[PDB]
Design a protein around this motif. Structure first.
Motif, short mmCIF file in Angstrom:
data_model
loop_
_atom_site.label_atom_id
_atom_site.label_comp_id
_atom_site.label_asym_id
_atom_site.label_seq_id
_atom_site.Cartn_x
_atom_site.Cartn_y
_atom_site.Cartn_z
N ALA A 117 0.84 -1.21 0.00
CA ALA A 117 0.00 0.00 0.00
C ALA A 117 0.88 1.27 0.00
O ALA A 117 0.67 2.19 -0.80
CB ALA A 117 -0.90 0.02 1.24
N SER A 118 1.85 1.29 0.91
CA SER A 118 2.78 2.43 1.07
C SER A 118 3.57 2.64 -0.20
O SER A 118 3.90 3.77 -0.58
CB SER A 118 3.77 2.18 2.21
N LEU A 119 3.85 1.53 -0.80
CA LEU A 119 4.58 1.54 -2.04
C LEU A 119 3.72 2.23 -3.10
O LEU A 119 4.15 3.21 -3.71
CB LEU A 119 4.89 0.12 -2.47
N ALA A 120 2.54 1.69 -3.27
CA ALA A 120 1.59 2.17 -4.29
C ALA A 120 1.36 3.69 -4.19
O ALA A 120 1.62 4.43 -5.15
CB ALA A 120 0.25 1.46 -4.14
N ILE A 121 1.04 4.16 -2.99
CA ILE A 121 0.70 5.57 -2.82
C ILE A 121 1.88 6.53 -3.05
O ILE A 121 1.71 7.65 -3.57
CB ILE A 121 0.03 5.84 -1.41
N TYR A 122 3.06 6.10 -2.67
CA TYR A 122 4.28 6.90 -2.85
C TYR A 122 4.56 6.96 -4.36
O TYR A 122 4.92 8.01 -4.91
CB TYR A 122 5.38 6.24 -2.01
N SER A 123 4.34 5.82 -4.99
CA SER A 123 4.49 5.67 -6.45
C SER A 123 3.56 6.66 -7.14
O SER A 123 3.96 7.36 -8.06
CB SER A 123 4.10 4.26 -6.88
N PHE A 124 2.33 6.73 -6.68
CA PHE A 124 1.33 7.50 -7.36
C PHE A 124 1.68 8.97 -7.23
O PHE A 124 1.75 9.67 -8.22
CB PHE A 124 -0.04 7.21 -6.78
N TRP A 125 2.02 9.43 -6.05
CA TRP A 125 2.38 10.84 -5.92
C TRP A 125 3.53 11.24 -6.82
O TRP A 125 3.75 12.43 -7.06
CB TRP A 125 2.73 11.18 -4.48
N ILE A 126 4.29 10.27 -7.28
CA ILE A 126 5.39 10.54 -8.17
C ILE A 126 4.88 10.60 -9.59
O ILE A 126 5.21 11.50 -10.35
CB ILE A 126 6.45 9.45 -8.07
N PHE A 127 4.10 9.59 -9.98
CA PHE A 127 3.41 9.61 -11.25
C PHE A 127 2.74 10.95 -11.48
O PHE A 127 3.01 11.64 -12.45
CB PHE A 127 2.37 8.51 -11.28
N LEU A 128 1.92 11.35 -10.52
CA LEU A 128 1.10 12.54 -10.59
C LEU A 128 1.93 13.79 -10.82
O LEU A 128 1.52 14.72 -11.54
CB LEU A 128 0.32 12.68 -9.29
N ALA A 129 3.12 13.83 -10.22
CA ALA A 129 3.99 14.99 -10.35
C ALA A 129 4.57 15.17 -11.79
O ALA A 129 4.59 16.27 -12.33
CB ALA A 129 5.11 14.91 -9.32
N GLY A 130 4.95 14.07 -12.44
CA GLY A 130 5.49 14.15 -13.79
C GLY A 130 4.40 14.37 -14.81
O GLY A 130 4.61 14.98 -15.88
N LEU A 131 3.22 13.87 -14.47
CA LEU A 131 2.03 14.12 -15.23
C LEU A 131 1.66 15.61 -15.27
O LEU A 131 1.41 16.15 -16.34
CB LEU A 131 0.88 13.30 -14.67
N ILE A 132 1.60 16.27 -14.11
CA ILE A 132 1.33 17.72 -14.08
C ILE A 132 2.36 18.43 -14.94
O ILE A 132 2.11 19.48 -15.54
CB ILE A 132 1.39 18.28 -12.63
N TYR A 133 3.57 17.88 -14.93
CA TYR A 133 4.69 18.53 -15.54
C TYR A 133 4.42 18.50 -17.04
O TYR A 133 4.58 19.50 -17.75
CB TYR A 133 5.96 17.83 -15.11
N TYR A 134 3.99 17.33 -17.45
CA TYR A 134 3.60 17.05 -18.84
C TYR A 134 2.47 17.99 -19.24
O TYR A 134 2.60 18.79 -20.18
CB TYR A 134 3.10 15.62 -18.96
N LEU A 135 1.39 17.87 -18.49
CA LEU A 135 0.20 18.69 -18.70
C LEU A 135 0.59 20.14 -18.92
O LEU A 135 0.14 20.79 -19.87
CB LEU A 135 -0.70 18.66 -17.47
#
Ligand SMILES: CCCCCCCCCCCCCCCCCC(=O)OC[C@H](COP(=O)([O-])OCC(O)COP(=O)([O-])OC[C@@H](COC(=O)CCCCCCCCCCCCCCCCC)OC(=O)CCCCCCCCCCCCCCCCC)OC(=O)CCCCCCCCCCCCCCCCC
Ligand code: BCL
Ligand code: BCL
Ligand SMILES: CC[C@H]1c2cc3[nH]c4c(c3C)C(=O)[C@H](C(=O)OC)c4c3nc(cc4[nH]c(cc(n2)[C@@H]1C)c(C(C)=O)c4C)[C@@H](C)[C@@H]3CCC(=O)OC/C=C(\C)CCC[C@@H](C)CCC[C@H](C)CCCC(C)C
Ligand SMILES: CC[C@H]1c2cc3[nH]c4c(c3C)C(=O)[C@H](C(=O)OC)c4c3nc(cc4[nH]c(cc(n2)[C@@H]1C)c(C(C)=O)c4C)[C@@H](C)[C@@H]3CCC(=O)OC/C=C(\C)CCC[C@H](C)CCC[C@H](C)CCCC(C)C
Ligand SMILES: COC1=C(OC)C(=O)C(C/C=C(\C)CC/C=C(\C)CC/C=C(\C)CC/C=C(\C)CC/C=C(\C)CC/C=C(\C)CC/C=C(\C)CC/C=C(\C)CC/C=C(\C)CCC=C(C)C)=C(C)C1=O
Ligand SMILES: COC1=C(OC)C(=O)C(C/C=C(\C)CC/C=C(\C)CC/C=C(\C)CC/C=C(\C)CC/C=C(\C)CC/C=C(\C)CC/C=C(\C)CC/C=C(\C)CC/C=C(\C)CCC=C(C)C)=C(C)C1=O
Ligand SMILES: COC(C)(C)C(=O)C/C=C(\C)CC/C=C(\C)CC/C=C(\C)CCCC/C(C)=C/CC[C@H](C)CC/C=C(\C)CCC=C(C)C
Ligand SMILES: CCCCCCCCCCCC[N+](C)(C)[O-]
Ligand SMILES: CCCCCCCCCCCC[N+](C)(C)[O-]
Ligand SMILES: CCCCCCCCCCCC[N+](C)(C)[O-]
Ligand SMILES: CCCCCCCCCCCC[N+](C)(C)[O-]
Ligand SMILES: [Fe+3]
Lengths: 281, 302, 240
Positions: free
Chosen positions: C3-21
């Motif tokens: 779970a901790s893995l998944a959520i930390y992963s996601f906050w990272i995904f989300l950050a590069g995504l905004i960057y993209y956006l």
């Protein structure tokens, strides 16, 4: 500082209040009289929030929480540490929000566009006012409002809900959710539709709208169209939030019992009320 | 007052548009439908035509089978009495097999078999319709955004009634077909896992839901606000920036400090909505497979 | 744990995504500029995205963004202060000059084509089989300006063929010439068409189209622009 095409738009005028006084910008941002208003309300509010935090003795944001007055105070004023601070903070929020809306109006005018955006925003503002003003008044104490804290506010939600049973049975809550779901669905589609046309298959020409309308009639036999989907979006959104207010404003005021039980009206229609069998007979 | 353009003030109609042709098998498209002046006040007035094809029929047939398989069950519950059927319509429920049968396909029909049939029907219904979204796009040479966006939704549904029941060891963990019953199951699913408000995916998911409304409100009101400059004709605006696109971007830059382009805004869009069920799916999947209680998990982080 | 893995992963995904956006929305109007047009010093943390090229249908070429930006028209504005961030005052008639809420962009001087390569928008007279199917048919109704004076008469409706939409009202002025009026800026009444943005005396200033059976992206912008600008600049003539 300016977008390559911004300068010709930066002309004087459009202000609602105070002429040319605050008619100017700060970096990309437009100030205007209300630019100032919101700043002041925002400054004050954050201050008071920190002040609540020392009285609470924690600087940790997951912990900080500003609570309304307890029910015993009714709709009167309360001591700072005992609910006053929330009451001011609430006044300040309102000040901030409304002001932010009126600035949107002022920008609208300078640019010569419609007022649909300030308009739609007022629905958000009205939902907030429902939960901290309209409902508590009608109920009879500031104490029915939700507290300003990251998790404590989720708690109010959970406690307030479970008070009337499974809140799922609040009928306007059912309606309000259908929009939230529907809107997201429609935002999903709209976005996807335009992008797929603007970014076709590799090496092909930009599709056209005539393609957008075709893609959907092929899919579900109807295309609401371009002007439509934008009218649709605005509407689903505003409606979701409209029904959200409604479901709360009625809860605790004209209905204080378990929400599931309100459905007994249907099931107890005299024409089938006593007919045996099924689930309720 | 000024005109707002929420409703058309003059309707205009011409020969039924049979649409772009491309690689589409025209044999499969239907015949134009009537025109609705009712609808004409909002979006387009023309109904149809629609594309049938093999996948459409399979989808459409399985779709009805699912719905009917549930329907007969409701009737059987109602004592075949049309009055009870109406009185108790939201109370009826087609429930999964008991935890006893596990991932068994041998549950008796009144005891869970009928639920499996209905689901099997829904499964095929949904996937075929997915393939339909893809193909319809291919045949017009369009990006496959819609099919991929759709896949997100499919994710959450896949997880709720298939992937999670399988990883838990029994179909009984799935969602019953029923109006009030699937509400109860939801409410109960949170209670059992220690309050979903501590599931940070749930919380993320809510942010994107709330956000979808925020954005579609923003986008919609904007495009309407500048439709006085043909704002709503977004592809051409993308291909050749009009004042519309400019006023749009600037209104937002001047309000909050940054802004979108016309193609850009629609990327914000597709991702904000797609993240709702993406994050959602994940929050539910870990629920009860890896994490038994989100509050306890919330105290430690592990 | 997982779970901790998944959520930390996601906050990272989300950050590069905004960057993209974010970098994708930097495809127009960037890079930033100073009020004098020279490139601004601080363009934010985000780099310009790598250019993308759009293939426009009906052999109308290609478009590559980001690309060289230029207004391609004079701007009649003058500074009103000695430091950055203040309005720029029109040096002539903002309406006539096309600055302010009256601004127009130098779009291509070609009309928008439908999926088949035919002009998307047409006067209804030349649109075989189109008719007002509901509501009040404007055609023939006088047109009233915000000063409550009659300015002309609707002598046609320019429809959007692929969406069956009324886009503009074509109006015959006192001298026998006509102008287009955006559908979105007029109220069709039972006995008249009312235009709040323009006073009767400004209708003549509405830019004209070179051919009577077509409008180009450039002319749409110059018209919509002009009519919109009336809202702020006709203001002295508007009474109610
Ligand atoms: C577990 C989860 C599994 C559950 C399954 C659910 C999956 C649902 C995913 C739906 C995605 C919707 C995306 C919409 C979209 O763009 O679709 C069009 C896009 C292009 O469509 P096209 O028709 O092929 O092309 C038309 C044009 O040529 C090209 O048209 P175009 O320009 O519009 O397309 C270009 C597009 C291309 O889009 C893609 O390539 C899609 C990427 C899919 C990502 C999937 C998300 C998974 C979430 C992971 C979360 C972690 C938790 C564990 O560009 C992007 O959108 C880029 C996205 C940026 C992502 C940022 C990643 C950051 C990584 C970290 C870096 C470090 C940061 C520094 C700190 O479709 C795809 O590329 C397909 C993606 C399918 C993958 C599904 C996953 C399989 C399992
Ligand atoms: C309206 C429905 C219920 C309610 C039910 C829930 C539920 C249920 C959840 C939240 C969640 C959230 N709620 Mg709430 N919430 C309510 C009213 C509010 C109010 C308010 C003033 O009325 C605000 C500001 C918030 C704000 C928030 C965020 C902390 C969080 C993510 C929301 C989001 O993505 O929205 C979409 C908006 C955007 C993406 C725009 C950007 C928004 C940013 C994130 C705003 C943050 C503001 C916050 C940090 C405080 C700043 C105030 C001061 C200036 C410092 N809620 C009422 C009582 N709220 C979710 C959460 O995970 O938090 C625990 C969650 O699960
Ligand atoms: C007591 C209730 C619990 C709770 C338990 C749950 C549970 C359980 C779940 C949610 C889920 C969700 N919750 Mg919660 N939740 C609570 C309180 C809240 C509150 C609040 C208090 O304000 C809010 C705002 C939410 C909001 C949300 C959503 C963000 C999220 C689902 C998103 C979605 O759109 O799925 C809607 C979309 C779908 C289901 C996709 C399905 C797509 C398919 C393919 C459609 C096919 C149609 C079919 C074939 C029929 C055809 C149609 C006919 C032809 C007409 N919860 C409390 C704590 N919540 C879900 C989640 O993701 O959690 C993490 C979930 O599973
Ligand atoms: C990304 C997240 C959101 C999302 C996206 C999404 N959904 C999608 C898509 C996308 C991008 C599609 O492309 C696809 C679509 O084709 O939409 C037009 C779909 C879709 N999402 C749907 C529903 C849906 N999506 C939902 C949610 C969401 N979808 C998310 C919020 C929900 C919920 C629960 O919130 C629902 C109910 C379908 C409309 C469509 C998928 C259609 C499908 O798979 O059909 C399969 C089977 C059939 C053909 C069944 C037909 C059986 C019916 C005839 C029975 C009912 C009869 C009834 C009494 C009729 C009368 C109705 C009256 C109103 C008139
Ligand atoms: C009506 C449909 C939806 C909608 C629409 C909407 N929202 C909007 C708009 C529109 C059209 C805007 O134009 C405006 C905007 O500019 O967006 C970028 C806005 C906006 N919606 C925002 C947030 C927001 N909208 C939300 C909801 C929604 N907005 C709806 C679902 C939500 C939630 C919870 O769902 C949030 C969090 C802002 C990003 C922005 C308005 C910004 C603003 O008002 O600035 C003025 C105020 C400040 C700078 C800060 C003031 C500080 C206070 C004085 C003290 C803090 C008090 C607060 C009560 C504490 C709460 C703590 C929580 C943990 C509970
Ligand atoms: C290019 O083509 C197109 C697009 O583009 C890509 C599209 O996106 C789409 C896709 C869009 C859609 C499918 C959207 C369609 C929309 C809907 C079906 C509506 C959504 C909303 C609902 C289902 C909710 C319905 C609710 C209703 C009718 C409630 C009405 C009001 C009341 C009952 C009054 C309220 C009062 C109450 C409850 C009083 C309570 C009293 C006491 C408690 C006492 C389409 C079709 C398209 O064609
Ligand atoms: C087609 O067209 C369109 C555009 O572009 C052509 C657009 O851009 C947009 C806008 C949308 C986007 C850019 C996409 C991304 C947006 C979101 C996900 C919405 C969520 C937004 C936020 C989190 C940002 C919130 C920020 C705010 C309110 C401002 C931040 C402000 C500050 C730090 C300072 C606030 C200001 C003050 C105190 C007053 C002014 C300043 C003084 C000093 C006085 C839309 C809708 C659109 O439809
Ligand atoms: C008028 O009367 C007649 C009989 C004519 C009717 O037709 C009336 C019919 C009605 C009364 C029907 C009413 C139907 C509803 C109330 C339905 C409600 C449905 C929901 C609320 C569903 C909610 C959630 C469903 C979920 C999440 C389903 C998930 C399904 C799956 C992921 C499928 C999984 C697949 C299974 C387990 C089998 C797989 C087997 C393989 C071999 C692959
Ligand atoms: C926009 C106003 C919002 C105010 C929120 C709550 C303020 C409470 C005001 C009560 C003050 C005193 N009292 C009881 C004598 O009226
Ligand atoms: C599309 C980009 C916008 C995404 C919004 C990101 C902010 C959401 C914050 C939610 C707070 C969540 N959490 C994990 C503590 O529950
Ligand atoms: C989440 C809000 C983000 C808004 C970003 C605004 C970008 C501003 C760029 C710096 C301008 C600086 N300033 C105010 C010092 O002049
Ligand atoms: C949850 C939504 C948060 C929005 C993300 C913030 C993006 C800020 C981009 C600032 C861009 C700065 N610039 C270049 C305009 O000056
Ligand atoms: Fe759009």
């Amino acid at each position: 500082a300016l977008l390559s095409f911004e300068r010709k738009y930066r002309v004087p005028g459009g202000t609602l209040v105070g002429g040319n006084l605050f008619d100017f910008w700060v970096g990309p941002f437009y100030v205007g009289f209300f630019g100032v208003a919101t700043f002041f309300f925002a400054a004050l509010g954050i201050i008071l929030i920190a002040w609540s935090a020392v009285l609470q003795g924690t600087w940790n944001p997951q912990l900080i929480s500003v609570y309304p007055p307890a029910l015993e105070y009714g709709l009167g004023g309360a001591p700072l540490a005992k609910g006053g601070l929330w009451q001011i903070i609430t006044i300040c929020a309102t000040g901030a929000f409304v002001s932010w809306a009126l600035r949107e109006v002022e920008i609208c005018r300078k640019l010569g566009i419609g007022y649909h955006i300030p308009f739609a925003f007022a629905f958000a503002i009205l939902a907030y006012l429902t939960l901290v003003l309209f409902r508590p008044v009608m109920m009879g104490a500031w104490g029915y409002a939700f507290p300003y804290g990251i998790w404590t506010h989720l708690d109010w939600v959970s406690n307030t809900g479970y008070t009337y049973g499974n809140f799922h049975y609040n009928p306007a809550h059912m309606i309000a959710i259908s929009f939230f779901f529907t809107n997201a669905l429609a935002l999903a589609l709209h976005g996807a539709l335009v992008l797929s046309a603007a970014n076709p298959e590799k090496g092909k020409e930009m599709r056209t709208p005539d393609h957008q309308d075709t893609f959907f009639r092929d899919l579900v036999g109807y295309s609401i169209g371009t002007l439509g989907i934008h009218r649709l979006g605005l509407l689903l959104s505003l409606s979701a939030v409209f029904f959200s207010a409604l479901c709360m404003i009625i809860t605790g005021t004209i209905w204080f019992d378990q929400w599931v039980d309100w459905w007994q009206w249907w099931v107890k229609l005299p024409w089938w009320a006593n007919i045996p069998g099924g689930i309720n007979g | 007052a000024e005109y707002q353009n929420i409703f058309s003030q003059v309707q205009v109609r011409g020969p039924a548009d049979l649409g772009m042709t491309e690689d589409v098998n025209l044999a499969n498209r239907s015949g134009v439908g009537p025109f609705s002046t009712l609808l004409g006040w909002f979006g387009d007035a023309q109904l149809g035509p629609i594309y049938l094809g093999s996948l459409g029929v399979l989808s459409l047939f399985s779709g009805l089978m699912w719905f009917f398989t549930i329907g007969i069950w409701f009737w059987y519950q109602a004592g075949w009495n049309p009055a009870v059927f109406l009185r108790d319509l939201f109370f009826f429920s087609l429930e999964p097999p008991a935890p006893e049968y596990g991932l068994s396909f041998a549950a008796p029909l009144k005891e869970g078999g009928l639920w499996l049939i209905a689901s099997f029907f829904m499964f095929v219904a949904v996937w075929s319709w997915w393939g339909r979204t893809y193909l319809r796009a291919q045949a017009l040479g369009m990006g496959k955004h819609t099919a991929w966006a759709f896949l997100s939704a499919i994710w959450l549904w896949m997880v709720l009634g298939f992937i999670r029941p399988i990883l838990m060891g029994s179909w009984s963990e799935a969602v019953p077909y029923g109006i009030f019953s699937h509400l109860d199951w939801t409410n109960n699913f949170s209670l059992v896992h220690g309050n979903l408000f501590y599931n940070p995916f749930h919380g993320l998911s809510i942010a994107f839901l709330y956000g979808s409304a925020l954005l579609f409100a923003m986008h919609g009101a904007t495009i309407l606000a500048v439709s006085r400059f043909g704002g709503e004709r977004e592809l051409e605006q993308i291909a050749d920036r009009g004042t519309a696109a400019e006023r749009a971007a600037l209104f937002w830059r001047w309000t909050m400090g940054f802004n979108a382009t016309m193609e850009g805004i629609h990327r914000w869009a597709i991702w904000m909505a797609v993240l709702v069920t993406l994050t959602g799916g994940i929050g539910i999947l870990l629920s009860g497979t890896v994490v038994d209680n989100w509050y306890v998990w919330g105290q430690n982080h592990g | 744990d997982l779970a901790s893995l998944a959520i930390y992963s996601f906050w990272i995904f989300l950050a590069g995504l905004i960057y993209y956006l974010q970098t994708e929305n930097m495809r127009e109007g960037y890079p930033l500029e100073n009020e004098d047009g020279t490139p601004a010093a601080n363009q934010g943390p985000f780099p310009l995205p790598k250019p993308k090229t759009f293939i426009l249908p009906h052999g109308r070429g290609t478009l590559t963004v980001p690309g060289p930006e230029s207004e391609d028209r004079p701007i009649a504005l003058a500074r009103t202060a000695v430091s950055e961030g203040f309005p720029h005052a029109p040096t002539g008639d903002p309406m006539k000059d096309g600055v302010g809420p009256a601004s127009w962009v130098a779009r291509r001087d070609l009309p928008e084509l439908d999926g088949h390569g035919h002009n998307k928008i047409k006067p209804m007279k030349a649109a075989a089989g189109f008719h007002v199917s509901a509501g009040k048919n404007p055609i023939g109704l006088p047109v009233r300006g915000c000063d409550l004076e009659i300015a002309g008469k609707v002598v046609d409706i320019w429809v959007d063929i692929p969406e069956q939409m009324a886009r503009f009202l074509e109006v015959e002025l006192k001298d026998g010439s006509t102008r287009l009026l955006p559908m979105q800026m007029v109220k069709v009444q039972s006995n008249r068409v009312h235009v709040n943005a323009l006073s009767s005396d400004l209708f003549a200033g509405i830019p004209t189209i070179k051919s009577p059976t077509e409008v180009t992206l450039l002319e749409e912008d110059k018209i919509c622009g002009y009519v919109a600008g009336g809202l702020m600049y006709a203001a002295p003539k508007r009474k109610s």
